[PDB]
Design a protein around this ligand. Structure first.
Ligand SMILES: O=c1c(O)c(-c2cc(O)c(O)c(O)c2)oc2cc(O)cc(O)c12
Ligand SMILES: O=c1c(O)c(-c2cc(O)c(O)c(O)c2)oc2cc(O)cc(O)c12
Lengths: 102, 102, 104, 103
C-alpha cells in the first residue's frame, strides 16, 4: 500500500553549498556529495536540504566537509530548452531526515 | 571510504526482467514503487546482481511486496540526440540484501 | 550522533497498549528477526512505540504480524529484586521513527 | 528478517581487543550517541569481529568519532552468579561496516 524510502550517506561535500530562498521564504540548499567504495570508484550524489537543516547545511557545510546525511529519494522530471523530458534523482533531506557535520 | 546505503520497501512494477551476461551470471531489473499517503508514489530502478538476481528473477512478480537494501549508482549516457543523460539506480549485490514480503 | 535501528520481523504476541493520564498511547511488542545458516538463530527485540505510531501499532499489529520498524536504541537501567543492577535495551519508535505493516 | 543498526558517535574509552583460540581478533568499545531537545546521551556496547576488529583496535581511541553499522545480538551470561544476565550488543562483523571519521 505505502512504503519505506530511506537513504543514508557519509561522504565529502563537492563544492560550497548553494542556498536559496523560496518566496515563502523557506531555505533550500543544494550540495553534491561524494562517497567512494574501494575493491576505487567515487559516486556523486545530489543532496537537497529543506527547512531548518537547509539553514544549518548552508551555514556549516563547505567544500571538503565530511557529513552524514539521511533522507529519501525523489526523482524530479524537468524539461531542457529543446523540450524533451529529463529526470534527476535527488536525496531529499527534510524534517523526516537528518544531517550531522562530522 | 564513505557510506552509500539505500533501504526500500515497496511494490514491484512489472515482472522482473532477468538476463545473463557472459560468465554465466544473472542480472535482474525491476522498478519499485514506494508511496507516502498525504498521495505521492515514487518509482525506483532497482537492479540485482549475483545470487540475489536469480532469487529476484525467480520469486518477484508484478505487485510483489519486497524489502531491498542496496547502494546508489548513477550511470551517465549520451542519448541519441547528442545529449548527456543520467540514470540513478539502486544496486543490490553481495553487499546488499533483499527479502520477499508476505 | 546518529542512533538508528531498522528491523523487519514477526511480532511475538499481541501488542500491549496503555494510556497515560494525557492520555497519549504507549504500546509494547516483542519482535523476532531470524538469520538462517545450526539451521536458524532468531533474535527477540523489545520494541516500544509512542504517539501516533503507538495507536497504529496497538490497532493493527497482532501475534504473527510481519512489520517493518525504524527507531532508536534506548537502554534502561534498573535494580532487580536482588538489589542488582539490570539493563534492558529497547527499540524506541516515536515521531523520529517509522513503522509499516507488511503483507496483505 | 532484517536486523540492522547504524550509529555515529564518540568512543567512550580505549578499545579492548583480544584474540581467540584461532587467531581472530575481537575488539570491544562503548559508543556514545546524544540527542539534545537539554541533552540525553546513550551508551552502546559495540563489538567487532574479523578484519574490522583489527582496524577498530588499531585506529579507534577514546574520543574518536566513528560510523558503525551492525546487527543487534542480546547475549545471555552468568558472571558471578550472582545470577544470569543479558546484554544487547551491536555486532559488527563481515556483514556490517565501520568508518573512522574526522580529517
Ligand atoms: O523516518 C523518519 C525519521 O527518521 C524522522 C526524523 C525526524 C527528526 O526530526 C529527527 O531528528 C530524526 O532523527 C528523524 O521523521 C520521520 C517522519 C515521518 O513522518 C516519517 C518517517 O519515516 C520519519
Ligand atoms: O553491509 C554489509 C557488509 O558490509 C558486508 C561485508 C563487510 C565486510 O567488512 C566485508 O569484508 C565483506 O566482504 C562484506 O556483508 C554484508 C552481507 C550481507 O548479507 C548484508 C549486508 O548488509 C552486508
Amino acid at each position: 500500500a505505502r512504503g519505506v524510502n530511506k537513504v543514508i550517506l557519509v561522504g565529502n561535500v563537492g563544492g560550497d553549498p548553494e542556498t536559496r530562498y523560496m518566496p515563502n521564504g523557506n531555505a533550500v540548499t543544494n550540495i553534491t556529495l561524494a562517497t567512494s567504495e574501494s575493491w576505487e570508484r567515487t559516486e556523486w550524489h545530489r543532496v537537497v536540504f529543506f527547512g531548518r537543516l537547509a539553514e544549518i547545511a548552508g551555514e556549516y557545510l563547505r567544500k571538503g566537509s565530511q557529513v552524514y546525511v539521511e533522507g529519501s529519494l525523489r526523482t524530479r522530471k524537468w524539461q531542457g530548452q529543446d523540450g524533451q523530458d529529463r529526470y534527476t534523482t535527488e536525496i531529499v533531506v527534510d524534517i523526516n531526515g537528518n544531517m550531522q557535520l562530522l
